[PDB]
Amino acid sequence: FQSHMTILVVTGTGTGVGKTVVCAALASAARQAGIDVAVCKPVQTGTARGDDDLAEVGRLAGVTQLAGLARYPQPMAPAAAAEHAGMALPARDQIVRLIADLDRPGRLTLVEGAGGLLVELAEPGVTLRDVAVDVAAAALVVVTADLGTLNHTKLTLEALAAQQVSCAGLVIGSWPDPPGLVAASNRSALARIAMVRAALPAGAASLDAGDFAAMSAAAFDRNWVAGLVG
C-alpha cells in the first residue's frame, strides 16, 4: 500500500484557464472515490480584489484541508504583488515545507500554482516547476479549448520535460456547449499531445455543492482517479 501522499501540482497554460475549479473538481471526484484530499495554494495574489482560491475550493468541493502561505493584495505576478505591498516572496523551503507537512498515507495533495508554470513563486526565480522537482510531484495542466491553446500546451509540456517533471495529463478548464469547430478540433488535437483527463462544462464554478459533486464524478475517468493514490 502507499505509505505516502500523491502530490500533483496543478498548473495552467496561463491565467484564467480554470485551475481553481479544476482543483475543486478533482478534489470532489477523489473524495467521492474515498480518497482523502488536501489542497494547497502556497502563493496567492489579488487578495485585495477578493481572490481566494482555497476558499473557493472549500465552497465548491467541501474540502476542509486547505493549506495557504503567502497572500499578496494586488492581482499581479507574486514578485510585483510582493514588491507593491513592501513584502517579500517566501523562501523555496517554506513552500516545500507547507506541502510536506500535509503528508499522510494515500492522501492526494493538490498544489495550485499562481498563473502559469514559470511564474516566480520564491527567490531567486523559483517556480512551481522547481517545487514539483523538490517534492517529486507530477503536473496536471489546465488548458483552454480556444485558439492558441496548442502552442501554450506544448510550451508548457516541454518545460515540464526539461526538468523531468512527469505529466499527469491535461484538463480542459471550460468546455463549451455546443462545441464550435475550433473547440472540437482543439479537443482532438490536445488528445494527440497528451491524455485529456476531463473537460469541465463551462459554468461549472457557478454550480452548487450537489450539482458540482455530480459534475465532478462524471467528468473524470474513475479508473484514472482510482489509480492516483496506489
Added chain:
Amino acid sequence: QSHMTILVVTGTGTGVGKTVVCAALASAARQAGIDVAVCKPVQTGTARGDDDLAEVGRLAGVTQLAGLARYPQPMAPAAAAEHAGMALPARDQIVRLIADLDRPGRLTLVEGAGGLLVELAEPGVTLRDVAVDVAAAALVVVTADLGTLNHTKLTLEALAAQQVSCAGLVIGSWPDPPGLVAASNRSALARIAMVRAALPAGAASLDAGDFAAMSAAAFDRNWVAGLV
C-alpha cells in the same frame, strides 16, 4: 551569413500584434536604408479578412512579400488544412523559400502563424525547426498584459532548447495609459531580455505616413542597421 539577415518573428501566442511588428520593423529598416522582404509561409483566417502580407505591404511599403498557403478558417494551420482537406507545405518548401529570399543588404522577416510551436509544415514542423534550418535568430512579440511573463519565459526556453538565438522582444501593443500591471511588466520583461520596441496601442490603424513615423521612433536605428 555573417549578419542577422534572417529574423523569424514569433509571438507568445495569438493576437499579440505580430503582423504590425513585422510591418514596423520593415518600415524602420527601410528608413535605415535597408532592403526588406517579408515572408509569411502559412496564413490562416483569410475568409474572415486576414491577408497579413497585404497589411504589411500597405503599412510599410514592402513589395517583396512571399507566402505559400492561405487557409479560410481561423484555426491552427494543421486544423485549417484538415478542414479544407488540403495538406500544409513541406519543410523544404518553407526553408528554401526563405533561404532564396535571403540576400546581402537585405533583412528577411519570417512571420509565423500563432506562437512558436504551432505546426506550419508537414509533419509537425514548426517555426522553431525552420529557424534552426536557416540559422536565423528569433524576434519575440509579447503582450504587456497579465500572463506575459510566463508565456515569454516559456517561449525563450523553447528557443534556447534548440539553440535558436534571442534577438529580443517587442511589445506588440503598449496601452495608454499603461496601468499598474503593464507598467510593472515592462520593467520585468526588460530584466528578462532586451525590449527592442513597444508599439503604441492602435498603431495598426495608422496610414502609411504616420505608421512610418511611429516605426522610426519605435526601434533603435543602430540596432536595426546592425542586422544587415
